[PDB]
């Protein structure tokens with residue numbers, strides 16, 4: 001899959017995007033890769049932040065579905081017009097599919113002033129598609145219309161320009177070391193998983209594990225932070241504070257309300273703890289653990305200073321870029337599971353590495369999931 005290596009680009013905090021073509025003749029667009037949503041949705045009007053946009057009038061293969069879509073959300077809204085067209089991925093498999101496209105005609109706080117992308121590829125499942133699960137997601141269409149195996153993997157590398165790989169239809173073993181460890185996709189809507197235990201420097205937080213997944217835990221390439229439920233965040237910060245007593249920091253830093261700075265190349269990673277999440281394993285009573293360094297949760301702010309990239313949530317646990325940048329992540333849809341291996345590109349130092357380890361014995365893992 002050499003042709004797909006390094007097919008992702010981005011800027012810090014603005015997401016990872018892949019090049020796509022839409023319409024006939026092909027219109028090239030940069031499209032954000034989002035495992036936390038399920039619509040393929042592209043700018044279709046000359047919004048001043050956009051480098052380019054889908055011009056339906058120029059596409060012979062375009063088909064109007066004569067339906068609108070309106071999507072408010074936590075941090076903004078978009079609206080648009082549903083249709084289909086021929087879609088390809090130049091640095092992907094050599095195929096062209098007929099996919100649903102939401103042509104975005106109005107938005108608020110959706111596009112980023114300064115970014116180099118113009119749409120979103122929602123890679124999650126039909127159930128959370130807008131307006132409803134009848135709007136077939138892109139990857140479902142890809143699998144139905146081609147022999148592309150039903151899986152994709154992501155290597156998000158970080159550093160200010162970032163890069164990575166989306167391997168569509170498979171796995172490239174040079175992008176990770178050690179073994180892949182798999183967690184079950186609990187339900188096919190978001191990529192929901194179950195976290196069964198949490199450690200800060202080997203120290204168990206000792207919370208009821210249902211709190212780790214209240215009301216949801218997901219793997220989301222479209223979220224920057226590691227986001228934790230309010231209660232879990234509270235306990236986690238308290239233990240991180242304790243473990244890092246050597247220096248002191250204002251309450252605003254932990255809350256993501258201000259930054260903290262050092263001199264160039266003198267940053268003291270060693271006084272910050274590793275964070276370990278144990279995930280439900282493939283077998284009854286078996287778990288495994290993924291561990292990240294402060295290089296994953298203390299993120300450079302250029303516009304050496306750093307922001308604390310763990311934050312509180314009311315939507316559940318969100319394993320965003322902070323987690324994903326430590327690992328090669330395999331979205332093995334064919335087998336309803338997600339694999340984690342140590343990433344060949346993750347940022348580390350001479351003392352500590354991001355790690356994926358197992359097996360461990362963990363009882364009552366099913367009880368850690370939230371039910372309505």
Ligand SMILES: COc1ccc([C@@]2(c3cccc(-c4cccnc4F)c3)COC(N)=N2)cc1
Pocket residue numbers: 013014015016032034035036037038039071073110111120122130220221222223224
């Ligand atoms: C279908 O409607 C939506 C609404 C919001 C999204 C976002 C989204 C929309 C726009 C931008 C971004 C974004 C911003 C910064 C960095 N990375 C991103 F993915 C994220 C929000 O959460 C996730 N996972 N995707 C996707 C689809």
